[PDB]
Structures are given as C-alpha cells and as structure tokens.
Amino acid sequence: LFDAVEKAHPDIFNSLLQILEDGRLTDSQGRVVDFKNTVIIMTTNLGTRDISKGFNLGFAAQGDTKSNYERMKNKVSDELKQHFRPEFLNRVDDVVVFP
C-alpha cells in the first residue's frame, strides 16, 4: 500500500514501472526480488478539492444535471493525467473513484 501518493516527489514512482509491468525490482546489491504475487494499492485524493462547489464562473442556463460523482470522476481523471506520466498510468490495472 502506498498512502497519499500525491504527497511524494513525482519521481519515486518512476521506480514502480518495472514493478507494475515486469513484477520485479533490483536492489543495489544486484539481487532481483519478484512482485508477481503481490497486490499494489495506491491511495490519493487528487481532484477532490472542488466537491463543495456550486457552479462555475460565467453565465449558464439551467444547470449541470450530472451528480457530484460524475464531475468528481472527470476531475480525478484530469488531475491524474496532469500529475503522472502516460507510461505510468498505462500500467495501472484499475482506477477506482470513491463517492
């Protein structure tokens, strides 16, 4: 488990690539340790700063029919694409948004 992934430097996770694609990691002594039987979870709250928001700037007729879940899902997707490299997000099996 990697808790609060967004609060680390955006380079440590460069070391997770070979973990998420090859299931292995080499220490400084040259020994290979496999990760093929582990379950990797990374928790974050990116893109959730605007849950208590009513409307956007500018005039608009009617209103957003989408619930908070859809708007927050779109915001999370945008922030995830903004924060992480495409090759890192291409290796993650599932991205789950918590309502």
């Binding site: 009513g54 409307f55 956007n56 700037l57 500018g58 005039f59 608009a60 007729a61 009617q62 209103g63 957003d64 029919t65 989408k66 619930s67 908070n68 879940y69 309502p99």
Partner: protein
Amino acid sequence: DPYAKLFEERVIFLGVQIDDASANDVMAQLLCLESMDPDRDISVYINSPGGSFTALTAIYDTMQYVKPDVQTVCMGQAAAAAAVLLAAGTPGKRMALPNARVLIHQPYSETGRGQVSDLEIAANEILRMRSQLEDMLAKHSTTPVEKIREDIERDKILTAEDALSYGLIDQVISTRKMDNSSL
C-alpha cells in the same frame, strides 16, 4: 483584473466595435485557448454594436475552425455583425440575457469617387458580401433563406424570446441555478 480571471476560466470577452485589431486579438486568444486545452469549451460574451465585414468573416472562420465547442452569450446588444457571431456558436449552447436585443440588417457601405467600372466592381463585391451574409445567416438558423432575404431588407430588432423563436439562440437565462448535488 477581472478580465484576466475570466480568461483563465476560458471566457473570451468581446465588448468593442468589431474591427481589424479586435478581430486579431480575438483570433489570437481563441488559438491560445485551443492550444491550452482542445477539449474544454470556450465562452464568448457579445456586447458589440456591429463592425466591419472582413473582421466578422475572420472571427467566424476562426470560431468554426477550432476543435472545442464555442458557447455564445448575447449580452446587451448584437447590432450588425455581432448577431452572426452569436448565431455562429455551437448549436444548443447559444444563450442570451433576458432584457437583450438582437438586430439584423443588410450591410451598409460607401465608396470613394471613381470611374464607372470601379463602381461596378465595388457593387458586385458588395452584392457578393450581402449574399454571403444571407447564406451564413440561413445556415445557422431555422427560418428559410427567403425569409432572411425579406427580413434583412430593413433593420429588424428581435427580443430574447423573438430570437429564440427565430432560431438564433437556444436558451434564455433567468437566474443562477445550483447543481443537483445528489452525490
């Protein structure tokens, strides 16, 4: 600076007479906004008393060229060329203030002194521009082209609901509405 805050939220604001400098600024801003994000919509607020025709044409082409949808808000008045820009927004996202008017009329122009051949060429050009304006107004509206030709003979003023019935706009805003907020 409220204008900078509006721009950061992807709102392009047009409140001056449409000329070459204003058209260049609008096109530059539209290109920059498209480059920043080719997915988020761009909002254009119209409070202009018409303007030149070439600048109108350039702005219209730039609006039709960019990838993101364009949301046009009539705000005050749209006298001669601003009405076309209001009608040139993405269908379904063209709205207007309640107490606003939209005016439409055929273009007005004048030429300097010259020989008869030059005046004939100028008249041909002006007729071509008028036909182009009628085509653009017919494409982005509901009424048939013949109705447009009959209507733009003289100054025609339409209210918000009159414009909605005409098809230039799609919605009339009344008051700020909160989101559903249903989790």
